[PDB]
Design a protein around this nucleic acid. Structure first.
Ligand SMILES: [Zn+2]
Lengths: 293, 107, 49, 98, 263, 49
DNA sequence: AATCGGTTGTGGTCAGCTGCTGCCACCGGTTAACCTCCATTCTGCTGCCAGCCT
DNA sequence: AGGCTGGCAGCAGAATTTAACCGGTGGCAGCAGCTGACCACAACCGATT
């Protein structure tokens, strides 16, 4: 409504400014961390005290002194760009910084209750890890492609696990050959009856540790497969290596990111009416911690 | 008593509204289609490009000026490589890497 | 919102007045002091003014 | 800290104590204690009694001791072990009593 | 270059080349990631003067990128030997650009650091704070240049710090705005405008118009004698003569007694 | 001015790293620093030191 | 005799570019033994773990 | 055989180390070389009462 503030106000309304509001209030983008010159003590162009953005420092003058009276009132100097007008407009003109990466507002993330956490249904601890680049979040998943290629990907995983177990079988054969060589080179020569079992005990330890390596690698492959089969949006992936294995093998079918650009993609893929309807069904039917939450 | 000045001047004039100098309005257009109006003085040469309120330069809307040209970077990683290598040395290195990947994949 | 933000918990009041998109009809005794007009009491009411 | 820091750079058998020592932080520490500290105060010169009572003063607040708003009502009391050591009578009457 | 003006190659060769094109980027990333720890250990020396630790690390990382670009493997040196120069240069030039609110350029920061080392050495080896003459003779400049540099080396104080000890009053509540309207000068100027208009009004019409158009008392634009002469149809010397006679009239006590108090 | 200058310094350096093609360790460290500087501009000490 | 306006002989004069001629700030790029991680009180929310239920 | 709910305890917010070359370019700053208009003292006129 009013902006000059002549005192007929009816209301004062507060709201949440979007980026179009911010870069519509602004009179220019500030793009240098400079304030004033160290020698002449006059403001620097594009800096934090710039006259082309915030208005002139002296009443009815430009910056280069080319226009210097009220006869030239309201024009812009074609050289320096300073609009010649009053110097008290430097209490009224805003500028803006255009960020190269999105940033969350601290007021809507941090302070209890976390309003971003309540809207998206993320815990504050799981939200801090995303927006401060310590974990990934699944922004999207594909259900048609996953449901139509699940069988083929299961076949691929079974093939690779078969190859791993065949590798362990080859190691079983090779260490059995070395064990039989140890048997022939220990039982047919005179030594301690316990010392001929120490080398075979070391061989059995080698077999135990090698099949333990194979078991841990098979467990890691099962973990990757279960993680892909239970993939849904708003799901945190700590273990950067697990995320990298997921994007390596199944790089389609889902997307993920860290930070406030992922938070803003989750807010883009957010259905306010459907979420409100499901919450109202919960508060009508269910009871307990679910209803209070 | 501390006394400071934000280094500016305050003039004592009557702000009139009638006897003012004439002005002409230009119109500029940035690379995302935005449009801005700038009031220049009537006896003044209108510039070709103007830094607008988005912080991006906008060209003048009247089709007259063939002004902007290339101001190309003379410093890329290829330039820094070329000032210390030769074409035949780089070609030998490329062919050795190609033979290694042929021996690796094909053999 | 303008008389509740100046009472206490300014940051919490302003951060959900913005989410609820609240509007302030300036009816009170404290919101007229802040913005600088006549309080709606005493001689500042339309019967007497 | 600066002694170790410029002991690692410089070549050994070419260094000496006046090349290792930088006395500027010691000078600045003593200077910023004596000016701009809470316990280094302008001397109370109204009369000789003000002067003599500004020395022989035991203040419980300062850098390293309790604040004024965060101090409880229990440290502002007179304790029976103050007999002969601190005066129960002479104390400020403002928001510093005790 | 080949994809410029067409010139299609075999598809096996095209697939072969793209592998080394992406492998080069992988190698460059591997080299940078291997030497980031060198950047950190080199950048921890500059903590405590203006910049924060992570700003120093990131400007060192820009320097390490250029050391990767300019590295020559045929000279047979280590990577860290060559890269330490570029990392140190990037950290020091960034600190010169970004340490202070009012930005002093790099060459002036270099002479300020030079004067600082000189002053520390003289205070150590002299037992006394050296004079500007001793500093200017040690550094080969004039004794006023020393004071100019020493006054450019001053950092601002904060408007938001508590200047009290108990009242919780900041500094900005003690600084008088020396450029506000004084509210008695602004009404004295108004009454001066009215009185000057009265004294000019009690002259003749053309005689008052000459002085008003000469001094620009109507539009702020002081015209010249030839402009007023073509305004009234008169010549320049006659305009100057009647202007001199009106100044003689206005210098009278009967006119200037009411205006003597306004100076 | 110090808080605004931190925001502008880290934003300009992030633009340099993105157009330089730096690895994601460096780019993510720069983005996290930019986020913390804007947080310190709006509400200092709310999250961290 | 004056009197309101021109003409101007002539002598400074006074700053306004105009070259112009240094010259001096200001900013970018480079440097190649080797050495790699910094008080008290009240209120509300969020996570923990036993304990009955199918 | 497991599971989801009740106190329960812990935590957060609000109130009263080191420097130097080299290239190159734009800004500065000072000063004759015109000015080109300004200023002025004085003198010489153009009708006109
Ligand atoms: Zn201008």
């Amino acid at each position: 409504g009013a902006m000059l503030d002549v005192n007929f106000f009816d209301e004062l309304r507060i709201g949440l400014a979007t980026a179009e509001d911010i870069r519509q209030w602004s009179y220019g983008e500030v793009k240098k961390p400079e304030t004033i010159n160290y020698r002449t003590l006059k403001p620097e162009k594009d800096g934090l005290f710039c006259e082309k953005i915030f208005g002139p420092t002296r009443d009815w003058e430009c910056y280069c002194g080319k226009y210097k009276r009220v006869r030239f009132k309201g024009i812009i100097c074609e050289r320096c760009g300073v609009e010649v007008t009053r110097a008290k407009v430097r209490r009224e003109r805003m500028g803006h910084i255009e960020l190269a990466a999105p940033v969350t507002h601290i007021w809507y993330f941090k302070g209890v209750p976390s309003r971003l956490g309540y809207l998206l249904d993320l815990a504050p601890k799981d939200l801090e890890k995303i927006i401060y680049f310590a974990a990934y979040v699944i922004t999207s998943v594909d259900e048609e492609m996953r449901h139509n290629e699940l069988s083929t990907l299961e076949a691929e995983m079974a093939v690779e696990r078969k190859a791993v177990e065949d590798q362990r079988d080859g190691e079983l054969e090779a260490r059995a050959q070395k064990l039989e060589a140890d048997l022939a080179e220990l039982e047919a020569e005179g030594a301690k009856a316990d010392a001929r079992r120490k080398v075979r005990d070391g061989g059995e330890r080698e077999m135990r540790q090698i099949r333990d390596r194979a078991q841990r690698e098979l467990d890691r492959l099962e973990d990757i497969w279960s993680t892909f089969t239970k993939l849904a949006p708003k799901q945190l992936i700590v273990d950067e290596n697990l995320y990298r294995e997921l994007v390596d093998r199944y790089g389609e079918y889902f997307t993920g990111a860290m930070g406030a650009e992922s938070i803003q993609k989750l807010i883009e893929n957010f259905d306010i009416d459907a979420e409100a309807e499901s919450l109202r069904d919960v508060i009508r039917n269910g009871k307990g911690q679910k209803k209070l939450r | 008593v501390l006394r400071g000045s934000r280094l500016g001047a305050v003039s004592y004039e009557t702000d009139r509204n009638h006897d003012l100098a004439p002005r002409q309005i230009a119109r500029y257009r940035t690379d995302n289609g935005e449009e801005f109006e700038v009031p220049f003085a009537d006896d003044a040469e209108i510039p070709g490009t103007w830094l607008c309120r988005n912080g991006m330069e906008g060209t003048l809307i009247e089709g007259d000026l063939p002004e902007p040209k290339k101001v190309k970077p003379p410093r890329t990683h290829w330039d820094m490589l070329l000032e210390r290598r030769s074409i035949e040395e780089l070609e030998e290195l490329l062919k050795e890497r190609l033979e290694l990947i042929r021996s690796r994949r094909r053999g | 919102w303008l008389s509740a933000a100046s009472f206490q918990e300014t940051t919490r009041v302003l951060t959900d007045a913005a989410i609820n998109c609240r509007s302030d009809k300036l009816n009170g005794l404290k919101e007229n002091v802040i913005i600088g007009k006549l309080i709606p009491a005493g001689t500042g009411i339309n019967r007497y003014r | 800290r600066v002694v170790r820091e410029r002991m690692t750079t410089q070549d050994v058998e070419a260094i000496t104590p006046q090349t290792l020592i930088n006395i500027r932080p010691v000078v600045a520490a003593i200077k910023e204690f004596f000016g701009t500290s809470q316990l280094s105060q302008f001397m109370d010169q109204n009369n000789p009694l003000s002067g003599l009572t500004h020395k022989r003063r035991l203040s419980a607040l300062g850098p390293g001791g309790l604040s004024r708003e965060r101090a409880g009502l229990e440290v502002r009391d007179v304790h029976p072990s103050h007999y002969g050591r601190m005066c129960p009578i002479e104390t400020p009457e403002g928001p510093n009593i005790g | 270059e080949l994809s410029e003006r067409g010139e299609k190659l075999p598809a096996a060769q095209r697939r072969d080349m793209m592998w080394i094109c992406r492998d080069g980027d992988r190698a460059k990333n591997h080299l940078l990631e291997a030497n980031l720890r060198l950047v950190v250990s080199l950048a921890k020396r500059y903590t405590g003067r203006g910049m924060a630790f992570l700003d120093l690390i990131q400007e060192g990382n820009l320097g390490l990128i250029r050391a990767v670009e300019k590295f020559d493997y045929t000279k047979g040196y280590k990577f860290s030997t060559y890269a330490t120069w570029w990392i140190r240069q990037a950290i020091t030039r960034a600190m010169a650009d970004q340490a202070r609110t009012i930005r002093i350029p790099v060459h002036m920061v270099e002479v300020i650091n030079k004067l600082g080392r000189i002053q520390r050495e003289l205070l150590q080896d002299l037992g006394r704070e050296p004079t500007p003459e001793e500093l200017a003779k040690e550094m080969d400049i004039t004794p006023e240049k020393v004071l100019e540099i020493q006054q450019y080396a001053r950092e601002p104080i904060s408007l938001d710090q508590t200047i009290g000890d108990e009242g919780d009053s900041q500094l900005g509540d003690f600084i008088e705005d020396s450029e506000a309207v004084v509210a008695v000068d602004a009404v004295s100027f108004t009454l001066l405008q009215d009185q000057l208009q009265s004294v000019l009004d009690t002259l003749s019409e053309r005689e008052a118009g000459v002085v008003r158009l000469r001094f620009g008392l109507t539009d702020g634009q002081p015209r010249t004698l030839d402009e007023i002469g073509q305004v009234y149809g008169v010549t320049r010397e006659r305009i100057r003569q009647i202007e001199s006679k009106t100044m003689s009239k206005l210098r009278h006590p009967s006119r200037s007694q009411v205006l003597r108090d306004y100076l | 001015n110090d808080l605004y200058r931190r925001v502008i310094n880290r934003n300009n350096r992030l633009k340099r790293l993105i157009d330089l093609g730096a690895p994601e360790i460096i780019v993510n460290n720069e983005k996290r620093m930019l986020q913390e500087s804007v947080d310190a501009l709006f509400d200092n000490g709310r999250r961290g030191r």
